[PDB]
Design a protein around this ligand. Structure first.
Ligand SMILES: Cc1c(C)n(Cc2ccc(Cl)c(O[C@@H](C)C(=O)O)c2)c2ccc(C(=O)N[C@@H](C)c3ccc(C(C)(C)C)cc3)cc12
Ligand SMILES: Cc1c(C)n(Cc2ccc(Cl)c(O[C@@H](C)C(=O)O)c2)c2ccc(C(=O)N[C@@H](C)c3ccc(C(C)(C)C)cc3)cc12
Length: 277
């Protein structure tokens, strides 16, 4: 229908509010990420890691040194890279949670339901925003200061050689939608307010917030993408694809968390690296 009625102005105002929260909560947006991947930005080119020799030069640019070099160099590299991917994941939760609080009505929910929505929703947000940082060659790492190639990640040890491939194959199909930060801001909020998470108390207040986010998203996509019909429908299938692809990812590293013995990082040691930095 698309009318210029007072309810549409509220859906446009909600999109503006979610976008402003998207900028403050997340440092590296897709707008700046694409500027680095194409060299359009005035900043310096990021350090590129494509082989083992380039990775050794990258570690020398880090203040930390890792004073426990295990003999297995195939494990010294794979395990070290994976824990860098996990320490960054923890800081993303701090940013995701900061953005989740900005969604109208989220704080008014039950506190245990807020945990449940973030519990199962953090992974699906990571999969989405990670696509903004990667292309067909590699992924931007360390707040855009680095760039690790895709084929280098495939050259790691056999268990760690394909934990990023399910994310690259999703990105090439998700970036084809060519969404911008304005579209992603609403789309992230829709994933959080998914009212069918296992263990939700009152589903009624959650889906009521999501239905306004869904209406604000379809209005955003129809206005921002004039040459793309059914883009709202295509994006819903990408959301359901995140469901069955995250369950395969969470079950994948549970084998690593158990068979590597040193993967479940010590809780008190985590907080030391966060507060020092
Ligand atoms: C492998 C890898 C990936 C895929 N990424 C991007 C990434 C990951 C996870 C999420 Cl969730 C994510 O999501 C986006 C949307 C976001 O949040 O930007 C984006 C990395 C970022 C930094 C480092 C690293 O190793 N960096 C060095 C500088 C360091 C960091 C920390 C340490 C200590 C453990 C000692 C503290 C030591 C060295 C490695 C990776
Ligand atoms: C020094 C260091 C430490 C202490 N950790 C945590 C860590 C290591 C090893 C084990 Cl085993 C571990 O687990 C338990 C058992 C433990 O020993 O504490 C925990 C790191 C993780 C990743 C990188 C890295 O080199 N990340 C690469 C991807 C990059 C990223 C970004 C850059 C630039 C910023 C220059 C762009 C350069 C290189 C370095 C370190």
């Amino acid at each position: 229908k698309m009318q210029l009625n007072p309810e549409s102005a509220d859906l446009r105002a909600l999109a503006k509010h979610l976008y402003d929260s998207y900028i403050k909560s997340f440092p590296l947006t897709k707008a700046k990420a694409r500027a680095i991947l194409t060299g359009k930005t005035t900043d310096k080119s990021p350090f590129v890691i494509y082989d083992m020799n380039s990775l050794m030069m990258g570690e020398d640019k880090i203040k930390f040194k890792h004073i426990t070099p295990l003999q297995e160099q195939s494990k010294e590299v794979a395990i070290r890279i994976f824990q860098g991917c996990q320490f960054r994941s923890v800081e993303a939760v701090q940013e995701i949670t900061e953005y989740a609080k900005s969604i109208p009505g989220f704080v008014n929910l039950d506190l245990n339901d807020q945990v449940t929505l973030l519990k199962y929703g953090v992974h699906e947000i990571i999969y989405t925003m990670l696509a903004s940082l990667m292309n067909k060659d590699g992924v931007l790492i360390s707040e855009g200061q680095g760039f690790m190639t895709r084929e280098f990640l495939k050259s790691l040890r056999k268990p760690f050689g394909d934990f990023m491939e399910p994310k690259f194959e999703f990105a090439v199909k998700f970036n084809a939608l060519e969404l911008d930060d304005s579209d992603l801001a609403i789309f992230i909020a829709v994933i959080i307010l998914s009212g069918d998470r296992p263990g939700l108390l009152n589903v009624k207040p959650i889906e009521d917030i999501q239905d306004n986010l869904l209406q604000a998203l379809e209005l955003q996509l129809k206005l921002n993408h004039p040459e793309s019909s059914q883009l709202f429908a295509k994006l819903l299938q990408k959301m359901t694809d995140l469901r069955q692809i995250v369950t395969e990812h969470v079950q994948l590293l549970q084998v690593i968390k158990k068979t590597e013995t040193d993967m479940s990082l010590h809780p008190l040691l985590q907080e030391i690296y966060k507060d020092l930095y």
